[PDB]
Amino acid sequence: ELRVGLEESELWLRFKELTNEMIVTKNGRRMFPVLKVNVSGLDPNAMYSFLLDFVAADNHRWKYVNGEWVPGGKPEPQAPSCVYIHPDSPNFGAHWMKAPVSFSKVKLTNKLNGGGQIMLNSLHKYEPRIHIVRVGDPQRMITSHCFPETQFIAVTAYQNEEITALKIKYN
Numbered sequence: 001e002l003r004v005g006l007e008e009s010e011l012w013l014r015f016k017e018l019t020n021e022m023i024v025t026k027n028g029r030r031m032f033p034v035l036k037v038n039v040s041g042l043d044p045n046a047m048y049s050f051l052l053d054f055v056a057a058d059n060h061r062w063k064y065v066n067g068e069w070v071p072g073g074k075p076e077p078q079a080p081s082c083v084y085i086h087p088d089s090p091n092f093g094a095h096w097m098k099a100p101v102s103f104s105k106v107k108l109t110n111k112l113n114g115g116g117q118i119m120l121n122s123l124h125k126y127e128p129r130i131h132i133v134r135v136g137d138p139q140r141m142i143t144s145h146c147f148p149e150t151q152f153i154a155v156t157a158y159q160n161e162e163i164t165a166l167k168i169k170y171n
């Protein structure tokens with residue numbers, strides 16, 4: 001059975017319990033925590049690519065008011081659906097399964113200025129999603145997994161001082 005498990009789930013849940021925030025900038029910012037997964041049940045002999053995208057979690061935006069995240073208005077039009085290709089792609093099943101798969105280099109941005117960046121809307125909530133694509137498959141077999149522990153609000157600056165402090169503590 002194909003199993004894709006979140007690494008450092010306890011660490012993600014500490015951020016999630018405060019409501020997680022990720023900075024977006026012109027030139028793009030790496031995530032903390034970094035999304036990492038363990039994989040079992042691939043064909044060790046087959047070749048696969050790993051893709052990452054971000055799914056809009058709500059039909060409204062968010063605002064931080066009196067130390068609480070609350071509905072903040074109607075959403076902006078959805079950001080272009082940018083996909084990040086894990087730099088190890090394409091690779092054998094055995095490669096993906098022998099050690100955790102880390103998306104350490106993906107950058108989140110609020111400006112379309114190139115560089116394999118992912119564009120997100122500030123004050124909108126996203127859920128990371130990993131796709132496994134089988135190479136050389138006439139059926140283009142793809143299996144996608146969502147990671148609800150890793151949900152965050154995209155921000156130009158931290159709203160929750162507890163998030164600012166958690167980021168410094170664990171990073």
Ligand SMILES: CC(=O)Nc1ccc(Oc2ncccn2)cc1
Pocket residue numbers: 051053083131133139140141142
């Ligand atoms: C049957 C089928 O739908 N196959 C498929 C294969 C690869 C695909 O490329 C892709 N690119 C970016 C994000 C996600 N997916 C999409 C779809």
